Amino acid sequence: DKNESATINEMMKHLGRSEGNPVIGVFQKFLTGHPKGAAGAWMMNGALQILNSGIIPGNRNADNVDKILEQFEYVLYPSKTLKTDGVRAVSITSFGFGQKGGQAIVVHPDYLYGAITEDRYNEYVAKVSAREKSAYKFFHNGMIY
Amino acid sequence: RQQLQVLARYLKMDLDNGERKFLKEKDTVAELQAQLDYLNAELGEFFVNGVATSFSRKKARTFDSSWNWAKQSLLSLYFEIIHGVLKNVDREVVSEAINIMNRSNDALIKFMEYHISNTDETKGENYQLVKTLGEQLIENCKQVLDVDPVYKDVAKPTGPKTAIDKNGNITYSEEPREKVRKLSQYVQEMALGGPITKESEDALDKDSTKEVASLPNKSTISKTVSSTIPRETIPFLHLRKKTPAGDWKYDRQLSSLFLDGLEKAAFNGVTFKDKYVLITGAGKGSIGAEVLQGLLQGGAKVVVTTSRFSKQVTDYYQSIYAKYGAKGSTLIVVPFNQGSKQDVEALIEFIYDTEKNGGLGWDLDAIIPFAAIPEQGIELEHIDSKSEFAHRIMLTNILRMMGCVKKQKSARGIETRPAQVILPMSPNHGTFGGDGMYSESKLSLETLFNRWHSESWANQLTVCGAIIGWTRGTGLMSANNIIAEGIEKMGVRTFSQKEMAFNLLGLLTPEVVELCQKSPVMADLNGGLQFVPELKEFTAKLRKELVETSEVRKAVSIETALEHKVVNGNSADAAYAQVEIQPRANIQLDFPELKPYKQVKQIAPAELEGLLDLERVIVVTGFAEVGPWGSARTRWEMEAFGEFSLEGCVEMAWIMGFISYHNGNLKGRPYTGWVDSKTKEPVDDKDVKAKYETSILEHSGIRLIEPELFNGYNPEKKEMIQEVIVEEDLEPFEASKETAEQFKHQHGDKVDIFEIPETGEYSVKLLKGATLYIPKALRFDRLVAGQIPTGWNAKTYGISDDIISQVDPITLFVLVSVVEAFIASGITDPYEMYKYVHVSEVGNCSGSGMGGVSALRGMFKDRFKDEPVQNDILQESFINTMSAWVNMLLISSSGPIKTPVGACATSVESVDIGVETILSGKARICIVGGYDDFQEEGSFEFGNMKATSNTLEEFEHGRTPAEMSRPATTTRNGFMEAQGAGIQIIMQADLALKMGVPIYGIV
Amino acid sequence: EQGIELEHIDSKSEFAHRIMLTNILRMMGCVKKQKSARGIETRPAQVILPMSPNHGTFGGDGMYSESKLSLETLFNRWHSESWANQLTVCGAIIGW
Amino acid sequence: RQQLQVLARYLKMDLDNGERKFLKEKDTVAELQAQLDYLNAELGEFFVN
Amino acid sequence: YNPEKKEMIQEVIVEEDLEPFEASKETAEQFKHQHGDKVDIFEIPETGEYSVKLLKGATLYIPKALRFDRLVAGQIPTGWNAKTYGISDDIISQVDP
Amino acid sequence: GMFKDRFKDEPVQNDILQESFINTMSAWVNMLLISSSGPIKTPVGACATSVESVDIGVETILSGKARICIVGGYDDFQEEGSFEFGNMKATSNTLEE
C-alpha cells in the first residue's frame, strides 16, 4: 500500500497533476480480498462501474489512514462512497509477485462518441437498444431455467 | 485376571494408581465447585458474569487521520450541494463548514481551491451555490489556518412534543423550539430561569453561505448574559457555593462565570486543544456521545470506552472521528467493563504507560465517568445482583478509577496537572423509586466534594459535580420521554442530549477548570426541575392523563368502527378498502446509458470527429465476475452501497441456491415464482430480504473458511503425516496379492507377505525397522478467506455434471464469468461474432497465477495416497486449460490464445496482451481477465511467506473477518486470500459500433 | 476503615460498604417481603438508621461516608416505593 | 509387560482408563481454579473471605 | 526418483494397538489432535517427552512401491551443474532447478 | 515441495510457493542479470509456450513497448508429471518399446 501510493504519487507529480487535485483511491479488496490472478479483473470491473455511474465507492475498512501516506499529496483515501458528477478516467494498478507491475487506464465511453457522426451514433444507439432488450430476455430465461 | 495380577505384582505396576488419582481430583473439583457455588449464591449470576474483563491493550483503536477526513468531508459537501441534497437553507452546511475549518491546513486549502476554482458555475444553480459557498469556506480556512479548533454547535434546539392521534397512538417527536433557534438564545433562556425559579442577527435557516462567512469572526460581547439574570431568580443552569454551615446554595457570581462561558462558547466556540480526556458511557444515544463529539471538535485527545466493542461500534466511532475530529484531535476506542476492578486498573495503566511499554503515554486532564446500566422496576425488596453490580459501576469503580489516576500521577510526581472529574450527579435521590441502587450511587458521589479537602489527592484530581437534569433520549431516561412536554408547561426545562452535552462542555472551559482547581464545583444543570413539588406524583399523573386518553380513544374508535360495520355491512367498506402492490425484483443488466448525440458531442473536443482510427481504439463491451459477493452486479451493490437492493437480494438468493423458480402446480394451486429450494414453499420477492438476507450476508464475502467448500479443509485441523520407524512388528493384516507385492517391493526385508491358500489373499506383516506414516494435525492461523458465496453451484448457471466432474473448480468460475461477460455485451450466442469477424479473429488472453490447484493436489497428493484421481488430472491443472475449455464449450474460435501468468497482476497483463493482440491485427475481439482458486496448500504457503494476515493476531486486536482486509490503514498486516474470476470482453471500437454492443469504457 | 483514602479503596472498603449499606437495604427488603407474604400491613418495623454527620469530612475512612450518605435515600424511597406500610424510616444522625 | 498387555487385551481391560479420567479432572480443576482466582482478583481476599 | 520403484502410501485401519513410541509434547499433541480417541498420549515425568499409543481403529499410512513403465527421458547430461556456469550456491539453494 | 514434502512434514523453504510460479523464472532473470523495467508477459502454452512467447515478444516490440525481448520456454521433468503423462497415455510406454 505504501509502494503503490508512492508510485501513483510520483506519476502524478512528474506529469504536473495540479496541486490540490489528488486521485481518489479505491481499494476494492477491503470487501473482496485478494484473489491473486483475478485481482485486476475485479478492479477493472469496478473501474467500469465507477465510470458508468460516477459513484466512487469508499473503503469502509479505512478506519485510520496510515500517517506515512499523508506525504502523498496526490492521493486521497475515502472511507465512504462519493456520488460525483462524473468520472472521466480510472487508473488500475497491479503489483504481482515476481516484479509483475501493471497499469491500465480506462476512459469514459462517452469520449468515443465524439469521434463519430450523428448518423453513425444513432444507428449504434438503435442497435444497442435492440440488443439490450434481447439480452434481458436471455438473461431472465436463463436465470429462472 | 489372576495371571495379569501376578505379572502386575512382578512388574511393580500399581493398576489402580490412575483410578486413585482420579478420585482425589474429583474431590478437589467438588471442593472448588462448592467455593464457586457459594460466591454465586452471595453475589448472584448477574454480578459474577458482570465483572468479566473486556479491556485489552491490543484492542485499542486509534483514530487520528483528520488530515485525510477533512478532504473527504469537503468533497462530500461539494457533491451534496451539486446534487441538491444540501441547500443554502440547511444548517448541515454550516456544521460541515465548522468541521472543515477545524481541520484547516495548507493541503486542505489547495484541495478546496482546486475543486472550487475548477467548478463551472454555468452548469446550473447548484454549481453557482457550491462555487460561492466554496469561495467563502476557502476564505474561512485561510483565516483559521493557525487558530485552535472549536466546539461550536449550530444545530436547531429541539423541544419535546407528544401527540395522540384520533385512533389513540402516542407519537413522541423532538420539535424545533419557537423562541430558541440558536445556542446563544438557549443560554439567554437558561439565564432568565422561569417564574417557578423565583425565590423570595444571523442568516441560519435562510442563507447558510452568509452564516458560513460569519464563522471566523469572534463576536464581541458588549453586555454579558449574566447581567440579564433577574434579581431573586435562579437560572435553570447555575453553580452552587458551599456555605460555612455546609449547605450548597445558588451563587450568582459563580453562576455568572459559568453562564458567560456558555454564552462565549455559543458565539465563538471553545477549544479543547491539548486536553486529554477519558470518557466512559459514550455509546450512541448517550449524553456522553454528544460530549465526545464536542471534545473532538475542539481538538481534544480522547479515550472512549465501550462495553459493546464490535465492528458496528468501532465503525460508529470512526464515522464520528471522520466527521468531527479536528486537527490535533485523537480518538482511542477501547473495550472496557467499568464493573471490573481489573479493567479499571488496566485501562488507567494503559493510558499512563509509555508508548515503549505499549501505553498511550498520556496524562489526563479530564475524566468523564458516565458508564451506567438501567435498573428499572427494582424497589428496595428487589435489590439483588444486578443492583449491586450497577452500584459497582456507578460508584465503587468510579472511586477506584479516580484512585488509579491519583496513583499514576503521584508515582510520576505530577502535582500541577490535575484531572477534572466530571461527576454525573442526579437530583434523583430516591424520588422516582424502582431504580435499584441508582439513587445510592448518585448520592454517594457527593462525598467527593468533602473528600477533596480531607484527603491527599486534591493536587491530582479536581471535583466537578454536574447535577444533570432531565435529558431526553438516553439509555437511562428514554422510558420517560412521553411526558416531557407536560413537565415544561410548569415553566421548567428538559434537555436534549446536545444541550446537556453543551452544558457539560461548559465545565471544561478554562474558567471552570480554574474554579475546580480552587475548590470543588457543583453545577446544577437541572432546568428548575427541583422547584416542581411532589415530582414523582406529578409525572405519574401526566403519564395516566396520556395513557388513559390513548387507551380510551383506541377503544372508542374500535367500537365506533364495529357499530358502523354492523349498521352498514361489508359493501360500505369493500369500495373504501384499497389494493396494495408489492414490488417484484426486476434485475437489470445495467447497460450504459446513451445520451442524445448533442450532449455526447459536447464532452469530447470538436476536432476528435474523424481523427481516430476506431480499429485501434479498444473498448470493453462486457464484463463479469464470480467472487465472494457473487456477480459483478451484487458485488457492486455491496461495494458502492453496503447493502442489497431487492434485485441484489433475489440475485444473491438465486446464486446461493436459497430460492429456485417454479412454474406449475404447487400443492393444488398453480404457482409461478420463487420457492424455497429446500421446502419448496412459495417466497414472495418482498420476503426474500427478511427470509434470507441474514444468511446471504453470513455466507458471502470474507468469512471463516467453510470446510465444505474446500473438500473438508479445516485450517484448525490441518492433516500432515509423520514418518516413524516401527519399533515392534505390527499385527498382520490382509491385502490382495497385487497390494502385498507393492508392500514387499517397498519394504524388502522389513515386511513379510504370505499367500493365505484358502482365500488367495495375502497376509502382510510389517517388521521392526519398517517405515510407517502416522497422520498428525496442525492448527494453522489463517482461518478466514474471501470465498464464493456458500451454495454457488455451476449447475445453477446451466453447467452440466459431466463438465463439473471433468474440470478443476477454477474452470467453472471462468466458464460462468465468460458467459456472463458475453451477456453483459448483449452477445447471448457467441457464434454471432462470426457474422462480423473471421474465426481467426476472436482471441482469449485471460490467465491465472496458479491455475487448477485442485488438479495439482490430485497429482501431487491424492495420487501419492493412491486415492481415485481421474487419469487426465494433469491437463486440468494447466493455466491454459481454462481458456481451452472456454473455446471447446462456448466460443469455437481459431483465434489467438495467449495465456498470461502474472501472479496478482495477471488480469492487467491479460488486458495488455489483449490490447496488443487487437492492435497487431491478430484479433478484433479478445477475452481478457484472470482467475484463481483458494485451496489449503496455497493458503499454507502464503502464510509461511507471511504475505497473508494471521487471523489469530487479528482476533487479539478484536478484528472480525469483515475488517481483516483494511488497505492503506495504520494497522494493515497482510492480505486476505480470496478466489474467483473476472472477465472482460474487449474489442475494436469500430466493431463494437457495427455490432451494436454496449461500450463500458475505452482501454 | 482507618487510613483508607480514595486511592486505597479496595476489598475491605467494598466489603464494609456491603455491610453498612447494601445488606441494610437487603435486610429491610427481607423484612418487607416477610411482612407482605403474611399480609401484615398494620405493624411496620421502625428502622433506626445509623446516619452520620461525617460525609467525607475526616477522610481516610474508606467507603464509610458513602455508606452513611447513601442511607439518606431511604427518606425519599419511603414515599416513592411500596414498602411504607411494612417499614418506617428513622434516621438517627449520631453524634461524637 | 508384553504378557500383561496380551492378557489386558483378552480381558478387555483398559489399563490407562484411570490415568485418562485423572487428566480430564485435572483440567476441570484448573478451569474452576481460574474462575475462583478471577473472582479473588476482582473482589479481593478480604471480601471473598 | 526411480520409476521402477515409485513410492505411494496406503491408508490402513490399525486392527490392534501399536507399541507406544516416544515423541515431544508438541508432536504428541498433534497426534492427539488428529486421532482423538484413537490415540493416547502420556507425559513421561522424568524426561518431559510423551508416549504415543495409537489404538485399534486409528488410520496409518504404509508406504508401498509401484513399478511404472516410463523408464526413459531426455535428461540434461549427467554432471551438468549450474556452478560450472558461475551460478552461486545461494541461488542454487533458493530457486527451482 | 508444497503439495508433498510439506504434507510429510519434510524441511521445505518457507518461500517455496514463489519458486513454483511460472513467472518466477523471469523474475530471477531480471533480479540477477537484466534489471529492466520493461514488459513482462509470461505465457503458458503447454508444448507451444515457446512459439506463444515469440508471438508475444514480436507484438510487444511492434507495439513500441520494448525494443529487445527475451523469448523462449522452459520446463522440467519430474516424477509426478511423468506419471500423469503416462496416465494420459501421451508418452511412450518403455516396456512396450
Ligand SMILES: NC(=O)c1ccc[n+]([C@@H]2O[C@H](COP(=O)([O-])OP(=O)(O)OC[C@H]3O[C@@H](n4cnc5c(N)ncnc54)[C@H](OP(=O)(O)O)[C@@H]3O)[C@@H](O)[C@H]2O)c1
Ligand atoms: N437524565 C439523564 O440521562 C441523567 C440524569 C442525571 C445523571 N445522569 C447520569 O449521566 C450518566 C450518563 O447517563 P446517560 O443517560 O447518558 O446513560 P446511558 O445513555 O445509559 O449511557 C451509559 C453508557 O454506559 C455504557 N456502559 C454500560 N455498561 C457499561 C460497563 N459495564 N462498562 C462500561 N460502559 C458501560 C453503555 O455504553 P456502551 O454500550 O458503549 O458500553 C451505555 O450507553 C450516568 O452516570 C447517569 O446516571 C443521567
